[PDB]
């Protein structure tokens with residue numbers, strides 16, 4: 276068959292405020308978005324959403340689900356279940372959980388089933404609490420997937436490894452064209468298909484469509500990365516300031532000295548003074564690999580020799596992304612290093628441009 280569009284939303288919640296902090300979602304969201312973009316999906320990938328951010332994100336995904344489109348929703352993070360109703364827990368949720376602070380899976384699912392979409396895929400990779408087992412209880416083209424592990428230890432053991440994410444295996448094996456570890460865990464996959472649907476089905480391809488143009492530009496607005504800069508410093512140094520997206524809400528910056536002038540024999544440069552809403556620890560800025568910042572991106576896909584800084588949390592940017600690049604310089608016979616600065620405005624990078 277054909278897809279009228281291919282749209283995907285991936286949420287990975289990790290940095291929980293009142294609950295144990297998970298680690299696996301970063302990896303598996305990155306890997307699955309890589310897969311999905313190779314399958315022609317436009318993808319949003321958001322780490323660490325609070326209830327409000329998470330609800331706004333899901334609502335705009337649901338607003339893109341239209342007659343004939345193929346929609347994938349993926350969640351990883353803490354979940355709970357009560358009485359047949361499963362809940363995705365946002366990172367700001369209190370302890371104990373409540374339904375009031377959480378997004379109910381079944382509500383998203385009944386809204387996905389409403390649309391007359393050509394394929395709905397909804398995959399959940401939940402860490403349950405230890406004792407939170409299933410309860411005693413009494414369409415469109417749909418694939419529902421639901422994985423559980425009991426406890427963060429079992430979750431993080433089973434998700435340890437590269438490439439071994441349950442739903443990425445499932446989609447590769449079953450929707451195109453990892454040892455069992457200790458603990459309690461479960462997988463549920465349910466499907467109802469009128470005809471065969473696959474993620475490799477062509478998009479119904481338009482030369483001349485306003486609707487297609489709107490869909491592409493609405494997503495592309497949320498993914499404008501800053502136009503990489505080279506800063507002139509008046510002492511004759513030039514510092515190159517480069518950018519990369521790791522997620523829709525995570526940007527890596529990389530600073531490098533592109534040259535020193537004749538008179539300067541020692542030079543060093545770095546970034547500081549980021550917006551407070553992003554909560555950047557400066558010990559996790561200015562590192563000598565992007566791996567040291569906590570990025571999936573490596574020093575062999577990002578360019579060499581830079582100081583690397585990871586700006587996560589870009590959806591929390593109230594205003595403009597503004598920072599100071601600092602220079603240290605030392606003249607050919609001088610006893611002391613000179614310091615210099617310039618302030619950079621970087622705009623509203625990535626999902627920060629939605630301004631919500």
Ligand SMILES: CC(C)c1c(NC(=O)Nc2cnc(-n3nccn3)c(Cl)c2)cnc2cc(Cl)nn12
Pocket residue numbers: 281282283284317318319321324327328329331332333335336339493494497590591626629631
């Ligand atoms: C419309 C487009 C950008 C889009 C989404 N939109 C959002 O995720 N919107 C959002 C809206 N608001 C907040 N937010 N509220 C407060 C702080 N952050 C966030 Cl995180 C996300 C979501 N999923 C998809 C998939 C495709 Cl394909 N496109 N797309």
Ligand SMILES: [Ca+2]
Pocket residue numbers: 356357358407408409410
């Ligand atoms: Ca239960």
Ligand SMILES: [Ca+2]
Pocket residue numbers: 299302303434435436437438439440
């Ligand atoms: Ca993994």
Ligand SMILES: [Ca+2]
Pocket residue numbers: 593594630
């Ligand atoms: Ca604002």
Ligand SMILES: [Ca+2]
Pocket residue numbers: 611612
């Ligand atoms: Ca001095």
